[PDB]
Symmetry: D2
Subunit: 153 residues, 4 copies
C-alpha cells in the first residue's frame, strides 16, 4: 500500500558519490513515506565469485523496475547514464510513474525544448513536464511538484 | 516481413548519417527485413519522441547501435522500452573500447537484461558483415531456430 | 617546409568509422598540400604482444603533437573524446595552430556562447573563433576559413 | 607552499559541489598544499577559459578528477596543458567502471602520457584517503623522494 520508488542512478559507481550523494536523496524520498528501492544496495552487493553475478544483478534490477510503482531517475552527467536510461525506457513502457532528477547545469541535447535528449521525456506530458523534473534535492518534497501530488491523490 | 527498428546516434553527424547507416540498412534488408530507421522516418521535439515511441511499440525487434563511450542515451531508452515490451533484442557494437561495470560483458550489465544468461553473444554483433551470420540470433529469429 | 597537421579523432575505435569517415577527412587535408599525421595508422598499429605497447603508443602520439605544426581535432560526440581533449590541451599549451571539427549537431555545453565546454576554445580568439570551427567535411577547403588562410600566409 | 590545481567536473552539480569537493580539498591541504579550485576561483565564458588556462600555467601540479565514463572533456584539456607545460601530474578516480582502449590502464592510454612507464600507479589515486599516502607520488613530490 506504501508506494515504491526505484531510485535509478550512477552514484554507486563512485565511492564518494555512493556514500555522500545517495543518502540525502534516499532520505528526502523516505521523508515522504515512500519505500525506496536503491539497486546498488539491494542488488549489486553480492558474491562476485559466482560466474553469473552480472546476469543476476541485471535480472534483479529488471524485476524491481517491473514491481515498482514509479522511477526516480538521476539523469546527471553528459550524457546521462546508459543503465539508468534502459531502466527509464522500461518504466515508460510499463506505464510506471516517471520523475527525473538533474542538478547538473550543463545541457547535453539534440533540441531546443528540453535540456537533454528529447527521448528522455517521451513518458512525460507535452505541457507541464517540468513539474516532474527536479533540479535540487531540496525540491523533492515540494507540494507543488508531481511526486508529492502523486502521493496525495 | 519482420520489422526491425534501427536505433542509433548516427543521424546526429552529417558524415555518419550519409556513410554509416546505409551499409547497416543494406545488411538487414538482405535478410528480408523491413527496416525502420528513425532519423529518416522523422512542438517538434515532443512529436519526434512520440513517433519513435510508437515505432518501438509497433516493431518486431530492435537492432540497437550501442557504439560510443557511453552508448547513446536515446538508444538506451528505446532499448529499455523494447525489453519491457517483449520485443526481439539485437545489439551492435564495432567500437573496440570497453565502457563497463563488470567483467562478463563489454558494456554496462543492464544493457544485456533482455538477453539470455548463456549465449547472449549470439545477439551481439561486432561487425556489419556479422549481421547476416546464419549461426547468430537474428537469422535464427527470422527462421524459427 | 610542408605544414604538418595532427588529425586527432575517435574514429579509429570503430571499424566502420575508421574505414569510412577518416579517409575523406584525410583526403580533404591532403588536397590542401598538408602532411597529415593520423595517429591510429601511424602509432596504434603495433605488436600488441609487447607488455609496453600502450605506453609506447601514448609517447608516440605525444611526440607527434610536439612535432606537428597544427592540430585538426575531431570533437564530435557527447562529450568529445577524452584522448582528443588531452591532445588539444597539449597543442594549446605548445602554441600550435588549432582547428576544431564537429558535424554533430548536438550541444554538450556549460555555457551559452559555445556549443561545447568553453575550455575547448581557450586556444582560439575571443572574437572570430568560428573561423577555426568546421561543421562539414566540405568546409575544410574553404578559402574564407582559418586553415586555408594559415597555409597561404 | 606548492600549488595544486584541482581540476574536476564536480562544480557542475549543486550537490557534488557542496559535498564532494571539500573532502578532497581537505585531504590536499593536510599535506601543506595551496589548492586552486577553479569553480570557486571563478564575455564571461571566454574569461573563465582564460582564467583556468592561466591557473594551469601558474600551478606547480594538477590533481585531475577523472571520474566518469568518459572523463570530463574540460579536465582533459587542462591535463593536456599540464603535461605539455611539464607540471607535476596526479590522477584521481574512485569510479570503479572501466572506460578504456587497452588492457594496461583503466582509462584511455593517452591520459597516462605524462606518467612514467613503470610506477604510474603511484600517481593514480582511487580513494580520497589514499591522497595522503607517504608511499605515493604526491608525498614524494612534496619532499623530494
Amino acid at each position: 500500500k506504501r508506494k515504491i520508488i526505484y531510485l535509478a542512478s550512477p552514484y554507486g559507481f563512485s565511492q564518494q558519490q555512493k556514500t555522500l550523494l545517495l543518502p540525502p536523496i534516499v532520505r528526502a524520498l523516505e521523508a515522504l513515506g515512500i519505500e525506496v528501492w536503491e539497486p546498488f544496495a539491494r542488488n549489486n552487493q553480492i558474491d562476485f565469485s559466482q560466474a553469473d553475478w552480472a546476469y543476476r544483478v541485471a535480472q534483479a534490477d529488471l524485476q524491481d523496475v517491473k514491481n515498482c510503482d514509479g522511477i526516480f531517475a538521476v539523469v546527471n552527467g553528459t550524457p546521462p547514464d546508459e543503465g539508468v536510461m534502459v531502466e527509464l525506457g522500461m518504466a515508460i513502457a510499463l506505464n510506471k510513474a516517471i520523475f527525473l532528477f538533474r542538478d547538473d547545469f550543463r545541457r547535453c541535447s539534440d533540441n531546443e525544448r528540453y535540456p537533454l535528449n528529447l527521448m528522455l521525456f517521451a513518458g512525460l506530458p507535452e505541457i507541464g513536464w517540468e513539474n516532474y523534473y527536479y533540479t535540487s534535492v531540496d525540491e523533492i518534497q515540494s507540494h507543488d511538484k508531481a511526486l508529492y501530488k502523486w502521493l496525495t491523490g
